[PDB]
């Protein structure tokens, strides 16, 4: 139960007052029978929705070991710490919503390695640094909300980013480009 061990490490690192992770047993054959965790017909985890579980702490890199993982919804929590640089090891992730959190650190480079990525919503977080140019190589990008963050630098108008409007990039620290309403020097 590699997936189960990984998710269990995640549980250990997480702070869970409501004990929503209580149902997770490392001794089990797999994680697939756990609450909020969904597996495919191949008995591998395609989904984890922990959203608004009122959790604290930070995440783990072992999440990147889920190959068939599709949906990850962590949204509406106090969760802190950086976004794992090895998250790019997730090929099949179609949705990532971290929004409404204490998450920090720069936006990981390896995220450019997600080909099937559709939803990315980071809005209302503490993230800083530039917005990776590798994300333009993701052609499947549909909905992105970065609004109300500390992100800085120039915003690429190429690739999939051409699909997006300033309200998504709004209320940031300093952002420049055709996409923003503030010009680059």
């Amino acid at each position: 139960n590699l997936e189960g061990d990984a998710l269990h490490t995640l549980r250990v690192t997480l702070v869970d007052p409501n004990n929503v992770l209580q149902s997770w047993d490392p001794t089990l054959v797999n994680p697939c029978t756990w609450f909020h965790v969904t597996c495919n017909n191949e008995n591998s985890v395609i989904r984890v929705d922990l959203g608004n579980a009122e959790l604290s702490g930070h995440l783990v890199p072992e999440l990147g070991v889920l190959k068939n993982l599709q949906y990850l919804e962590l949204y509406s929590n106090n969760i802190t710490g950086p976004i794992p640089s090895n998250l790019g090891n997730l090929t099949n992730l179609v949705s990532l919503d971290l929004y409404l959190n204490s998450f920090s650190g720069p936006i990981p480079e390896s995220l450019g390695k997600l080909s099937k990525l559709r939803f990315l919503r980071l809005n209302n977080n503490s993230l800083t640094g530039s917005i990776p140019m590798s994300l333009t190589n993701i052609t499947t990008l549909q909905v992105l909300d970065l609004s109300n963050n500390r992100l800085s630098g120039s915003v690429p108008d190429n690739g999939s980013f051409s699909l997006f409007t300033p309200i998504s990039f709004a209320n940031n620290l300093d952002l420049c480009g055709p996409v923003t309403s503030h010009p680059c020097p």
């Binding site: 697939c32 029978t33 909020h36 017909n41 919804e73 509406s76 949705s95």
Partner: protein, 740 residues
Amino acid sequence: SLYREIHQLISFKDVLPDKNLLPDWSSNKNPCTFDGVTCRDDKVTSIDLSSKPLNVGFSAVSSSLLSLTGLESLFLSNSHINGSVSGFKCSASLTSLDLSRNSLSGPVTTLTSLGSCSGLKFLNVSSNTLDFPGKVSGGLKLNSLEVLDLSANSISGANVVGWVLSDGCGELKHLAISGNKISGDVDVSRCVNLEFLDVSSNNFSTGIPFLGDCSALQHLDISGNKLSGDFSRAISTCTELKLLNISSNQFVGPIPPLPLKSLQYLSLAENKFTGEIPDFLSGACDTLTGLDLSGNHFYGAVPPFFGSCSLLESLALSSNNFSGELPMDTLLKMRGLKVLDLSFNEFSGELPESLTNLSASLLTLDLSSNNFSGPILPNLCQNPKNTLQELYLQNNGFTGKIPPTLSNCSELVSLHLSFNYLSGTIPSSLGSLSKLRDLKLWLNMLEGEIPQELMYVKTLETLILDFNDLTGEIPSGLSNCTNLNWISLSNNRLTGEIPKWIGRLENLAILKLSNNSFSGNIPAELGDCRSLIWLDLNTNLFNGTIPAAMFKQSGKIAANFIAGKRYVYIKNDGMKKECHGAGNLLEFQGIRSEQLNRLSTRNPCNITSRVYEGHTSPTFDNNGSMMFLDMSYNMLSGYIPKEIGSMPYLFILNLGHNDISGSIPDEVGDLRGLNILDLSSNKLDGRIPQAMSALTMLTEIDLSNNNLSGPIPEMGQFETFPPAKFLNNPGLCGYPLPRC
């Protein structure tokens, strides 16, 4: 003495936040006349404050009470005392101290300061919040303790035992460290007098404790650990040994040699042990009381030489690969046998007639989960004064009828006949059992109506009739059972309306009517049941409307008596339309999952997903609400009142495939615990209330086939859900559906 005695007692009485605490304590009274105080010759030798919520600190105790000259013993158990041990004045007259079940906190090293008591022999600190931060150095420096109990604390570390015994174990007759996290190696070899050791429930990944000569040791509990290696050679030096619990460990291989001379209790249970029961074990037959081999790879048959043991009280072979016939000849040679658990084995064949004798001896007979075949023995309980308590026959190939000779067992508190091929009707004579608690007959071919005479059982708690051919309506007499906490009747042919007298049961936790012909209106009297967290009504003929007062009891709900029972929840996947409702909750005690295929004939559900297991665990002890509601696939009509949103603890709500017409209440948005919601196939109209965006717990929803109109709420989880669930809603728009 007496003056400062009473003055110290009162000076302690002054520190209590509750001004009225000690009723008889006052100045101008003989201290020896006080409650919880035992005085000898006008000198205080004892004080017992146990189970009295003092809500005071230890610092107040050490100064006032422990300074008493001539005081031998102080029992503070469950006195709600907080704080930590500090340096203080202690009389040498002190003998026994009980701090157990209290709030004492801080590092364990503080206990080193108890050496101020010169005559201190017996110390119980068990069940406190004490821990051990960081490294272990030096020692406890108490060698005078004949008894030490550290059990149920927060201590996490390695070789803490060495820190305890640093000053030597020479005088120590008793040690219990349990309920902690401790690793490393255990050396008791310097303690020649130690008669008792409980290290259980800990972190040891390493070798077994070093017992040295192990001359005087009568008790060894290593259980609840990761331990592996050879324990035989370690305990081979122990001549006199009684209780050995090695259970729940990583031990492997065949059963090795043991010190069987004085052995009373032996548990090898819950391990990787292989092979079968060795012969040499018979050497313990002059002694052995009870035995647990459960949870191993053991197979074969029971050695008949165990007939030499008349002292065996309990025999547990459960959870193994065992097969073969019943050694009734050997079993009858055991006079003191009481509980026999054969459950979860491959045992086969019909039932030997001689078994009819055991009704006058055995307390518990568990044959459950086996390859057994044949009829149920009608001659059973022919012998006078039948002593049988619990009978579990479930999961077998047993055929024939159910003989109403079982009424002749009057001591039977539990009957599980379930998961079998048994035919025939239900004998009314079963009503003659006043002591019966758990009656589970489910999954059989049973026919005929329900006995009215069951009204004569007031002690009835769990009744499982599920998955049978039974017909007829429900006897009103069942109302006379006020102690029923579980009612599950599913996949049956039962008809008729639903009783209105259900409100009479304050103890009822669970009601499952699923897959039946019942009709009529859902009674509002359900709102009078304060124990009820679970309702599955899905496939029935019920007409009428849905009352809003049914939820009035939510928030006062007490599920306390419901806990402790094994359950299975089988989730209905919406792929196949022939499998109805959210899911099926059934009582799984004493049954294998692998045999669930026996349901293949009775239910259309497969493709390999998905099963949920466990034990009943309500989310609240008191003042909660309904955790489960499935009315799906019925004739119910009208509009849903605002009260539908009064149950925050509700995990799953399925109203699907009904005639319900009206607007979805904004009160729906008040449910924070709802994981799965099916409103599908109804007449409901209007707009989805924006308040529903307040639901963050939904992993599944189906809104399809309604009259609903307007934009889909963008916020909340609606964006996560597929348009597949939103189909057949003409006026409905907004993501995931197309933009307006």
